[PDB]
Design a protein around this ligand. Structure first.
Ligand SMILES: NCc1ccc(C(F)(F)F)cc1
Ligand SMILES: NCc1ccc(C(F)(F)F)cc1
Length: 330
C-alpha cells in the first residue's frame, strides 16, 4: 500500500508545515506537524485544559467508535525549543492520504505549553523519528511509520517541502517525477533515535567548497538550519552589516541585503539552498533588521538540518533494516 498527502506552510515564512490526518471513526481530520525529529503522535483533544486551547481543532475520542483508552499509559515530551506537552493515550485508526493504520497510539494532550496554544494552525504533531524516542510509559509505542512499514510497498517515506508553497509527503513509494538528476544516499546512525547523518562539507555563495564532516539530523520539525559556529560565521561574514545579536538571539542582517546561497554536501553530491530561503523577515513588525535562517548550533549540542535545508531538496527517509537518507535536487 501507499499514501500521499499535501503539506502546506502555516504562514508566509514557512515556520512550519501542516498535513491533514484522519483520526477515528467516523474520520476526524486534524492538521498535524510531521516531525522527523520526534516520535510521538499527539493531538489537541477534548481532554486538553480548556484555557490552553485557542482555535485548534480537537480530537474527541468519545465520538470515535474505534477509539480505545490505553489503560494506565501516559506521555510527557519536551522539545529542544523548550516546548512541552503531556497527557494520556488512546489507540485509534489513523489515515494519511489513503494509507490507514489501525491500533495507532494517539496521545491525547491534557496539558500543552504556551507555544502550542499560541499556534492556532497546528492541531498536533506526527512523529517520524525512530520509535525508541517515543515517550509513552510504561509501554513504549510505535510511530505511524513503524506501524505502516510492513504493508508499505517500500519501507520509505519522502519529504518534498515547498518554498512559500505546498509540498508532499509520500509513504511507500518514490516519485521519480518529483526530482531532477539522481538521488544520493548516505548512511544513517540510529543510536540517538534520530535520522542522523554526516554531511561532507559546505560552500558559501560561489565560494570554494570546504570538505569537512558535519554530523547532524534531518528534522522536518525544526524551522531553521543550525550548524557549527565556524560554518555559520563564515556564512554571515559574506553579508554586509550582518551580526550576531544577543538580545535577538541569533544572527540578524539588514533587510536590504541580498543573501548568498548555501551549499551542503551529501556524499559527492551538492544541495544548493538559494539565498532567499535564508531570509526570515523583520525581527519585529516594521523593523529594518531581518532574522537569518542559518544559526549556530553551539547552544543546542547537535546540528539540525531543518526545513530551510530540507525544502531545497527531495528527501528520502529509507526505513529499511539498514536505514539511509537520500537527497536529490529538485
Ligand atoms: N523536531 C524535534 C526535535 C527538536 C529538538 C531537537 C534537539 F534540540 F534535541 F536537537 C531534536 C528534535
Ligand atoms: N520541533 C518540534 C516542534 C514543532 C513545533 C513547535 C511549535 F511551533 F509549536 F512551537 C515546537 C516544537
Amino acid at each position: 500500500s501507499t499514501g500521499s498527502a499535501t503539506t502546506t506552510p502555516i504562514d508566509s515564512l514557512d515556520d512550519a508545515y501542516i498535513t491533514p490526518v484522519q483520526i477515528g471513526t467516523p474520520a476526524q481530520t486534524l492538521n498535524l506537524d510531521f516531525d522527523t525529529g520526534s516520535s510521538d503522535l499527539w493531538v489537541f483533544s477534548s481532554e486538553t485544559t480548556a484555557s490552553e486551547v485557542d482555535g485548534q481543532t480537537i480530537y474527541t475520542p468519545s465520538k470515535s467508535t474505534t477509539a480505545k483508552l490505553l489503560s494506565g499509559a501516559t506521555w510527557s515530551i519536551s522539545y529542544g525549543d523548550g516546548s512541552s506537552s503531556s497527557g494520556d493515550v488512546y489507540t485509534d485508526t489513523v489515515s494519511v492520504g489513503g494509507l490507514t493504520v489501525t491500533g495507532q497510539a494517539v496521545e491525547s494532550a491534557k496539558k500543552v505549553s504556551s507555544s502550542f496554544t499560541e499556534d492556532s494552525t497546528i492541531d498536533g504533531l506526527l512523529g517520524l523519528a525512530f520509535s525508541t524516542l517515543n515517550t509513552v510509559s510504561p509501554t513504549q509505542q510505535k510511530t505511524f511509520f513503524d506501524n505502516a512499514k510492513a504493508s508499505l510497498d517500500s519501507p520509505v517515506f519522502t519529504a518534498d517541502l515547498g518554498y512559500h508553497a505546498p509540498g508532499t509527503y509520500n509513504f511507500g513509494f518514490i516519485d521519480t517525477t518529483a526530482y531532477t538528476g539522481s538521488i544520493t544516499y548516505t548512511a544513517v546512525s540510529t543510536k540517538q533515535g534520530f535520522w542522523e547523518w554526516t554531511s561532507t562539507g559546505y560552500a558559501v555563495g560561489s565560494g570554494t567548497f570546504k570538505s569537512t564532516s558535519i554530523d547532524g539530523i534531518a528534522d522536518t520539525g525544526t524551522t531553521l538550519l543550525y550548524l557549527p559556529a565556524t560554518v555559520v560565521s563564515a556564512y554571515w561574514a559574506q553579508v554586509s552589516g550582518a551580526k550576531s545579536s544577543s538580545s535577538v538571539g541569533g544572527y540578524v542582517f539588514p533587510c536590504s541585503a541580498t543573501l548568498p546561497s548555501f551549499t551542503f554536501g551529501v556524499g559527492s553530491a551538492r544541495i544548493v539552498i538559494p539565498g532567499d530561503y535564508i531570509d526570515f523577515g523583520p525581527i519585529s513588525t516594521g523593523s529594518s533588521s531581518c532574522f537569518g535562517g542559518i544559526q549556530s548550533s553551539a547552544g543546542i549540542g547537535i546540528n539540525i538540518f531543518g526545513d530551510v535545508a530540507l525544502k531545497a531538496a527531495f528527501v528520502v527517509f529509507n526505513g529499511a533494516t539498514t536505514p539511509t537518507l537520500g537527497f536529490a535536487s529538485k
